[PDB]
């Protein structure tokens, strides 16, 4: 097997090419910009409707409605401005580890330990939420499935595979197979043409929703990447791992720009999201509290400590007006 | 204020009442977790009861509703979803006693028990350890000595000794012999007493949970 000799030299060539493009560091460039100061964000809402531990959430493009999944078999659709429950969709399998909100708002989705993330119809006659489709075909727990549009949806399962679906058809039109560990997160680019995804091999990748080929491959973590989130510009993305370290990567330089680590932080990250502008890096940890990293100088700005258990999900509204955190405490805070 | 939002608040309160009502129905149920290494008798204990990622199995015995989650159909990293089954009432564990001479699979089952017994989530969760295929263990214990999987066996190669040796080798894997229990039962196809044994262990676990709730324990 002399073909593996090409792989080693190829990896060295990749590491050398990006090393030559590493002129300066993001710390040196942003060493001449004023910091963001202490960012004190207090709780505005508390959404108390779940009985088990909340495992996921996702805002709507209206930045007012948010879905949330939990292990008690319910998928509630909150109204954040008034804490009202707009729907409460009972799931056929209470082991749900992800949920999504269609950009238009006519559908939601949720999957888990049943290898299926099923699309629910919100805007329909008969005034009840009804399962539109049940997208089966994965061979492992579904960790994240996000909506491209009302008719397509990308998933990412525990069988080291991400797949692009067609809701009206129900068949994987494109399957992305390049990972060696199981995929644990996912995030769509603003233009919804590329997307990155964590894994359990400390390697996030970059795919194309139309071609299906792995564009680039980023590494540098020491443990399983738990979360991921695209920079609002679409040319960078942060990650979250079990080594208690977030790091902003870069699709242009093909390498990480900086790393957000603290000495008194030892628990893994479960959730990562940016802000509307892109200066804040909201990261939810197993320490029961969500930290706030200034995403340009890598200094901890503030702390969002209001949960009584591990924070498992995190989302920032599409207008940046609020930050919703959901913990195993069964409560879903909304900061501002 | 609240012109048409009064009816929205009323609908929210109605589905909140429905959530509270559906959460009490799922609290009076006993959730188990059927683990076990491959090729174990775990597919037969589901049939000993009343009975594609995980397959729930709902059944009722003596006015007690059991839910048994068989998670063997997921050949992925257990580290990344084993926290979903936290707070489960008990952990059933099927171990084939007739696999001590097949392939060192008994040591695989032993290390699996050590991993899902000293797990950071199942510290207080009791374990109902079953030992299936007792008849095949009977038939294969007289000719195949225990020295294959346990060469340090100092004793007679009879059933009442070697079976108890396996029982104490499995029971000597929890470093929390004060907080958690391990109910062992040399099950078989005899008289279907497995449901009664699971009911007894689950009743003890429920008594302990009630004691923790009322502040006594």
């Amino acid at each position: 097997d002399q073909l593996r000799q090409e792989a080693e030299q190829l990896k060295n060539q990749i590491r050398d090419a990006r090393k030559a493009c590493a002129d300066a560091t993001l710390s040196q460039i942003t060493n001449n910009i004023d910091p963001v100061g202490r960012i004190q964000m207090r709780t505005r809402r508390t959404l108390r409707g779940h009985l088990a531990k909340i495992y996921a959430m996702h805002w709507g493009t209206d930045s007012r409605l948010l879905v949330s999944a939990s292990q008690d078999g319910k998928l509630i659709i909150w109204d954040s401005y008034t804490t009202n429950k707009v729907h409460a969709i009972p799931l056929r399998s209470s082991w749900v580890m992800t949920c999504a909100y269609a950009p238009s708002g006519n559908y939601v989705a949720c999957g888990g330990l049943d290898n299926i993330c099923s699309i629910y119809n919100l805007k329909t006659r008969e005034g009840n939420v009804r399962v539109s489709r049940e997208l089966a075909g994965h061979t492992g727990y579904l960790s994240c499935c996000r909506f491209l549009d009302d008719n397509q949806i990308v998933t990412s399962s525990g069988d080291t595979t991400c797949a692009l679906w067609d809701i009206e058809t129900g068949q994987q039109t494109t399957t992305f197979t390049g990972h060696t560990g199981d995929v644990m997160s996912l995030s769509l680019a603003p233009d919804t043409r590329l997307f990155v995804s964590g894994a359990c091999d400390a390697s996030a990748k970059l795919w194309d929703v139309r071609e299906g080929m792995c564009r680039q491959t980023f590494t540098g973590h020491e443990s399983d990447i738990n979360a991921i989130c695209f920079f609002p510009n679409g040319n960078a993305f942060a990650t979250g791992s079990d080594d208690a370290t977030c790091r902003l990567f870069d699709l242009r330089a093909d390498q990480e720009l900086m790393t957000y680590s603290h000495d008194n932080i030892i628990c893994g990250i479960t959730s990562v999201s940016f802000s509307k502008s892109g200066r804040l890096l909201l990261a939810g940890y197993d320490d029961f509290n969500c930290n706030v990293w200034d995403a340009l100088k890598a200094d901890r700005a503030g702390v969002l400590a209001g949960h009584d258990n591990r924070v498992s999900c995190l989302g920032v509204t599409d207008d940046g007006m609020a930050v919703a955190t959901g913990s195993w405490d069964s409560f879903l805070k909304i900061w501002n | 204020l609240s012109a048409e939002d009064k009816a929205a608040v009323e609908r929210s309160k109605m589905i909140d009442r429905n959530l509270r009502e559906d959460g009490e129905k799922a609290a009076r149920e006993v959730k188990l977790l059927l683990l076990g290494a491959g090729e174990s008798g775990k597919s037969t204990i589901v049939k000993q009861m009343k009975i594609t990622g995980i397959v729930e199995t709902h059944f009722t015995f003596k006015d007690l509703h059991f839910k048994m989650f068989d998670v063997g159909g997921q050949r992925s990293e257990r580290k990344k979803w084993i926290h979903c089954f936290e707070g489960v009432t008990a952990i059933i564990f099927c171990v084939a006693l007739s696999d001590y001479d097949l392939v060192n699979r008994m040591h695989e089952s032993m290390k699996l028990f050590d991993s899902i017994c000293n797990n950071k989530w199942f510290t207080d969760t009791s374990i109902i350890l079953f030992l299936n295929k007792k008849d095949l263990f009977e038939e294969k214990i007289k000719k195949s000595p225990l020295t294959i999987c346990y060469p340090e066996y100092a004793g007679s190669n009879t059933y009442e000794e070697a079976a108890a040796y396996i029982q104490c080798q499995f029971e000597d894997l929890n470093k929390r012999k004060d907080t958690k229990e391990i109910y062992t039962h040399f099950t078989c196809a005899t008289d279907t007493k497995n449901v009664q044994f699971v009911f007894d262990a689950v009743t003890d676990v429920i008594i302990k949970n009630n004691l923790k709730d009322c502040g006594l324990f």
Epitope: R64, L65, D79, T82, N84, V86, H87, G105, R125, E126, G127, N128 | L1, A3, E4, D5, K6, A7, A8, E10, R11, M14
Partner: single-chain antibody, 232 residues
Framework: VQLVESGGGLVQPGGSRKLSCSAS????????MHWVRQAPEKGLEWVAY????????YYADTVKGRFTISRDDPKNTLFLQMTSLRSEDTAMYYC??????????????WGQGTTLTVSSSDIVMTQATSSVPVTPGESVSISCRSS???????????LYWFLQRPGQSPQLLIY???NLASGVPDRFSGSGSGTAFTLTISRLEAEDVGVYYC?????????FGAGTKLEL
């Protein structure tokens, strides 16, 4: 979706009669139901309303005490037990459906209606032009002025627009003054602000003949308008 009523006929004044609206085709238990009557040659008029779970009931100022309303969720039936009828209650009684959450379209589906005949502080909507002529292809502009600013503090200006074609029941066109109803062509478009509303129709087509009522849903009792009729 279906809403059929039954219990119509001639009734002597002072008597009693029960109207039953039997729903079939939707989750009746989750919709708040209304009763809306219409005199033989007058506009619509609100009567009663039950919420989901019967936890809230309202009546008008003419049927309070006389009429009582009730729902049977397991049987999917809506009742209006009428007592002490008068010579003014002669009207077709419509069974209306209405669900209330963020982004809902209440008053979406209207029933067919009975033909009950009895032998012998509110908000006032005003539709000035009670009847105007119109030719296909032309643009119409119906107006409806309220006696109180409907624009609420949360931004939602509650004003609904209905269309009752000749021979049918009124269907929903616009809800909350801006939102088109499902299954309604994009020709219709509501505009206006508080106390001054308008329903502009562009590139008019056939089957648009009928009466156009403007209901306010700011507070009970809900009030309709006189109704502008379009003549060919």
């Amino acid at each position: 979706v279906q809403l059929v009523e039954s219990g119509g006929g001639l009734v002597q004044p002072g008597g009693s009669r029960k109207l039953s609206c039997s729903a079939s085709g939707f989750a009746f238990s989750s919709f708040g139901m209304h009763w809306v009557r219409q005199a033989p040659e007058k506009g619509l008029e609100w009567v009663a309303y039950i919420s989901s779970g019967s936890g809230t009931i309202y009546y008008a100022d003419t049927v309070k005490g006389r009429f009582t309303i009730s729902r049977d969720d397991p049987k999917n039936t809506l009742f209006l037990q009428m007592t002490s009828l008068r010579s003014e209650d002669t009207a077709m009684y419509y069974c209306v459906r209405s669900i209330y959450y963020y982004g809902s379209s209440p008053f979406d589906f209207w029933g067919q209606g009975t033909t009950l005949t009895v032998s012998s502080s509110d908000i006032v909507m005003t539709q000035a032009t009670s009847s105007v002529p119109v030719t296909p292809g032309e643009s119409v502009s119906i107006s409806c002025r309220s006696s109180k600013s409907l624009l609420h503090s949360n931004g939602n200006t509650y004003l609904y627009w209905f269309l009752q074609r000749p021979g049918q029941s009124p269907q929903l066109l616009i809800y909350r003054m801006s939102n088109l109803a499902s299954g309604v062509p994009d020709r219709f478009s509501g505009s206006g602000s508080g106390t001054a509303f308008t329903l502009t129709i562009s590139r008019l087509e056939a089957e648009d003949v009928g009466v156009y009522y403007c209901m306010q849903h700011l507070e009970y009792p809900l009030t309709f308008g006189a109704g502008t009729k379009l003549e060919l």
